């Protein structure tokens, strides 16, 4: 279930060449690599990582001979990444003065996978190239190179300083050389040859890579799915398999409380003490303590033994349909829980796949949804939610989101604003906010494509909490005397709106400031 990853970094002279204000492709690539290794180290993934550098001053690789595979160094052999590898990216690895053949480097990387995976058992094989393509190269036996990648089942991902208005901001939302242009076409051809038309999507810019999880895309562990049955009435039972589509990714590791001198968990102990609520408190016996519940004013003694027998006994795990209603009746404001389930058709079952497909399309065409009852097991508490259609070109499924019970709902009354004489804005005030929304719009529409383009897709940005934690964890591990470092600028750049949105908003914001008076109490 582990993956063999080889990171192929260009350290050539041209990677060090920087344009004022813009970070050198070498420093950019270093930041992307550190981002990758930090996740693999601190998330304690069992994936083995190797590191090959091309354009080094010296030559240290198994294919090195005469003029073949020159200026390529195998910095790290295939093994679980550690703090020593991270320390090397941070300060040990320096840019070189020579230039190497990126295809020669790709072969060295391929040779690493072929020889170092002999003993071990890997589910996925992956190579990540980080280059500027400014260096000269040979197309000799390229057709075989592409073929061997297919035969060995090794995937590729390219990372360039450029991607396929205003100022440059790394992580934010002049002219490529003829050698880079020539190099790019071979990269395109190779990617199309490996992953088809959609292969071009696997060529990223260093900047966008920092604000995406694309570096892990190919070595990402498959989602755990579970089977159940969708039951319309009693006689009909469609065989399904649902998994958690959305689930909040939270911090895995916990901060263990240790003594300041010894630095051990064992020396610290938590003990519970019991005392009476009445005046002049006395110690209460740990064995004599009985479970109880409040019923308003009354205090009812109810033991765990009697509770298990008298409690609500669920009829069992199911995905039973209660009824069907129009799309308009189910409002997003009533969605509940901490997950989204995608109800897919049972794997290796053709008849159940058509049976679910019939329901998906019937609900879509009629503009209707399905109110269903859900429980993962017989012990679990029952839920009532919406099951709505979701049809895309490649896949077809129902989407389950939990809905509320009467007890969950809260009813408050808020003052009307539509015709409030005291708070009604003037025609000039409304026309000022109208200009603000037009200036601060996060979407662009091309009339030829007639498709709406999002300029701030947040769902693509990774949670800054993790890479910030990893930064601090690594900094304390390598530099214990120094205090915590500040948040990296690229993390702030990816969280803030595009510079064009910020610049456009300047003029209407100053206008709404004067028109709308605001003061503290």
């Amino acid at each position: 279930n582990k993956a063999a990853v080889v990171l192929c970094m260009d350290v050539g002279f041209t990677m060090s060449n920087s344009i004022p204000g813009i970070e050198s492709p070498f420093e950019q690539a270093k930041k992307v690599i550190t981002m990758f290794v930090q996740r693999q180290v601190f998330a304690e993934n069992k994936d083995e990582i190797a590191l090959v550098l091309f354009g080094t001053d010296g030559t240290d690789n198994p294919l090195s001979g005469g003029d073949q595979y020159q200026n390529i160094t195998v910095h790290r052999h295939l093994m679980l990444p550690d703090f020593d590898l991270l320390e090397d990216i941070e300060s040990k690895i320096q840019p070189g003065s020579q230039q190497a053949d990126f295809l020669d480097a790709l072969i060295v990387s391929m040779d690493v996978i072929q020889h170092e995976t002999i003993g071990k058992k890997f589910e996925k094989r992956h190579i990540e190239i980080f280059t500027d393509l400014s260096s000269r190269f040979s197309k000799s036996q390229l057709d075989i190179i592409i073929h061997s990648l297919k035969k060995c089942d090794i995937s590729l991902q390219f990372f360039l300083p450029f991607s396929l208005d205003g100022p440059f901001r790394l992580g934010g939302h002049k002219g490529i050389t003829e050698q880079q242009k020539e190099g790019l076409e071979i990269v395109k051809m190779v990617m199309i040859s490996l992953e088809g038309e959609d292969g071009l999507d696997e060529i990223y810019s260093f900047s966008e890579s920092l604000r995406k999880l694309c570096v892990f895309k190919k070595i990402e562990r498959h989602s755990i799915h579970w089977p159940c049955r969708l039951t319309i009435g009693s006689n009909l039972s469609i065989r399904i398999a649902a998994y958690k589509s959305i689930l909040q990714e939270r911090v895995k590791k916990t901060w263990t409380v240790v003594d300041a001198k010894t630095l051990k968990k064992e020396d610290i102990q938590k003990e519970t003490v019991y005392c009476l609520n009445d005046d002049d408190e006395t110690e209460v016996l740990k064995e004599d303590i009985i479970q109880g519940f409040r019923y308003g004013s009354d205090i009812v003694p109810f033991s765990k033994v009697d509770e298990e027998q008298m409690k609500y006994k669920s009829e069992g795990k199911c995905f039973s349909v209660l009824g069907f209603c129009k799309s308009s009746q189910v409002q997003r404001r009533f969605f509940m829980g901490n997950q989204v389930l995608k109800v897919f058709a049972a794997r290796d079952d053709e008849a159940a796949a058509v049976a679910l497909s019939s329901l998906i399309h019937a609900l879509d065409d009629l503009d209707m949804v399905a109110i269903v009852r859900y429980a993962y097991d017989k012990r679990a508490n029952p839920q009532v939610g919406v099951a709505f259609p979701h049809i895309k070109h490649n896949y077809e499924c129902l989407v389950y989101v939990q809905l509320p019970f009467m007890e969950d709902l809260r009813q408050y009354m808020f003052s009307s604003l539509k015709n409030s004489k005291k708070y009604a804005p003037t025609e000039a005030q409304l026309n000022a906010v109208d200009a603000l929304i037009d200036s601060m719009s996060l979407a662009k529409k091309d009339e030829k494509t007639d498709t709406l383009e999002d300029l701030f897709p947040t769902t693509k940005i990774p949670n800054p909490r993790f890479q910030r934690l990893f930064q601090c964890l690594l900094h304390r591990a390598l530099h214990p005397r120094e205090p915590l470092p500040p948040i990296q600028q690229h993390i702030w750049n990816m969280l803030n709106p595009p510079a064009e949105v910020t610049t456009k908003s300047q003029i209407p914001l100053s206008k709404i400031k004067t028109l709308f008076p605001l003061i503290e109490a």
Partner: peptide, 12 residues
């Protein structure tokens, strides 16, 4: 002219 290449024995 194009630079000749010697592929690793396993590729051939």
């Amino acid at each position: 002219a194009e630079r000749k290449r010697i592929l690793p024995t396993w590729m051939l």
